[PDB]
Ligand binder design. Sequence first.
Ligand SMILES: O=C(O)[C@H](Cc1ccccc1)Oc1ccc(-c2ccccc2)cc1
Ligand SMILES: O=C(O)[C@H](Cc1ccccc1)Oc1ccc(-c2ccccc2)cc1
Lengths: 260, 260
Amino acid sequence: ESADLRALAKHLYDSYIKSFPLTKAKARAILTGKTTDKSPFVIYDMNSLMMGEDKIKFEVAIRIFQGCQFRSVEAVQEITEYAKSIPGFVNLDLNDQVTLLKYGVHEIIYTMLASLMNKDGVLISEGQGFMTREFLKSLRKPLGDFMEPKFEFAVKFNALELDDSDLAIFIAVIILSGDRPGLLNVKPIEDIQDNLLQALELQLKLNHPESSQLFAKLLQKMTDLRQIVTEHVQLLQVIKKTETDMSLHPLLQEIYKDLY
Amino acid sequence: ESADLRALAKHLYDSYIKSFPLTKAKARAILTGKTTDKSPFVIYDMNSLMMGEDKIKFEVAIRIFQGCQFRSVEAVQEITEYAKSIPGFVNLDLNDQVTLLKYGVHEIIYTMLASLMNKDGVLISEGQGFMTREFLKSLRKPLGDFMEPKFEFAVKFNALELDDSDLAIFIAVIILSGDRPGLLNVKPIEDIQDNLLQALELQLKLNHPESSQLFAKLLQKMTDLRQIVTEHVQLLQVIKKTETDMSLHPLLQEIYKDLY
Ligand SMILES: O=C(O)[C@H](Cc1ccccc1)Oc1ccc(-c2ccccc2)cc1
Ligand SMILES: O=C(O)[C@H](Cc1ccccc1)Oc1ccc(-c2ccccc2)cc1
């Protein structure tokens, strides 16, 4: 039933657009900067970082880690809004909604971060700035280990050349994964996901004449994301046990884990 | 040894001032607004909230809860910086530093929030605005329950009339509490705290001729703070189990608890 699968595709796209201010279209407009309006400021050394403070909405590694922490609090609200717009979702068991969002959230953060990334760096500060990969690599040891797996993921992911209409569906599919630990009622989740998968396959055929095997490749990427989440959690766990400077400890995370 | 206890008092005061941008002196200057420069905008109904968006750095209840979430990520860094400045602290076992900060942090957030509060409301947005207690009480049910215990604590706490020099020591004493669960080496912590307690008693005698029993009253307040943290955690735990709107779930907290 393809009228329905198309209507669902559009519905997903319109909520994505409402929920997520910084889209792939916006990010690529800057990176393909014909639109010189927002030609981004390039932070490529300590010098240009220092100059860039007087023209962006801002130990450099600590700043960056806290930047990630702040971004997570914002991203959760965006993702939660979008999740609620997925037909069927708010009708699920309250505990399953929680479970699905809990595991979906970081997988989606990295999916969307890739929109801002290429092999040379990442857009920062609502696209105002471009921070160089080699600049990041030159910083304090833990920073680099954190970013490089994400870059590597993003280079392979971006070579699939998805647009925002593609991403809306992919992201919904991720949320509606019926194999999350602790799920109570798996069949209704699988039902919604099966229908989302068909909507995704059809969308990819329509939007991509320049490639085949895009659907399969994309489903492999949902597995890769689970690995990236896991490596990330584990780097943080090494820091928690071994880092001697308390300002480099996550810590808010250690508090919510143990006290809350 | 009172030259030392005074030098320590000053050392603590200077780091407090470096670590914490918004002080009690600043907050009281606004609330005793002879300095009309920053006479705060009063959000006292929905109408004045709506007008106040066009003159402050900003469902209203969700905005407020996320505001608290953002503030926590900022506060942890301030508090960690200050903790490191307390003589003896960075020489403790790494695990004990972690433990002390983990339990100290929320107790200090509420201690300092009181600086912004009176029985009629709370300073918001770096003191730019004053949000009314009765306005908060009129909002969505969970909001009110969250704030009222903090107001009640803050009214009794503020009636002790401490200044920033007093607070610096009190806060250090809190961090250096030797009864936190999981501490490895308790005696060195107790040693530093005993000396901080003397510095605190002497400070209070010198700074407060208009009251006696201030030291005792203040130590009772360290126990009260533990209750406020506990009630807070428990309200969040009720929301996690019973709230049907996912946008009203903490959730970042649920993710760090279960996945990290
Ligand atoms: O785990 C998370 O929620 C975020 C996820 C994220 C990763 C990259 C961009 C945006 C978000 O990653 C973090 C990385 C480092 C830290 C952190 C913060 C302070 C001190 C040390 C590490 C916190 C979160
Ligand atoms: O627990 C915390 O870290 C903060 C503590 C805090 C409380 C008042 C002012 C500043 C900080 O309190 C929160 C209160 C509500 C929420 C929250 C966020 C989103 C959805 C529901 C609740 C998060 C934190």
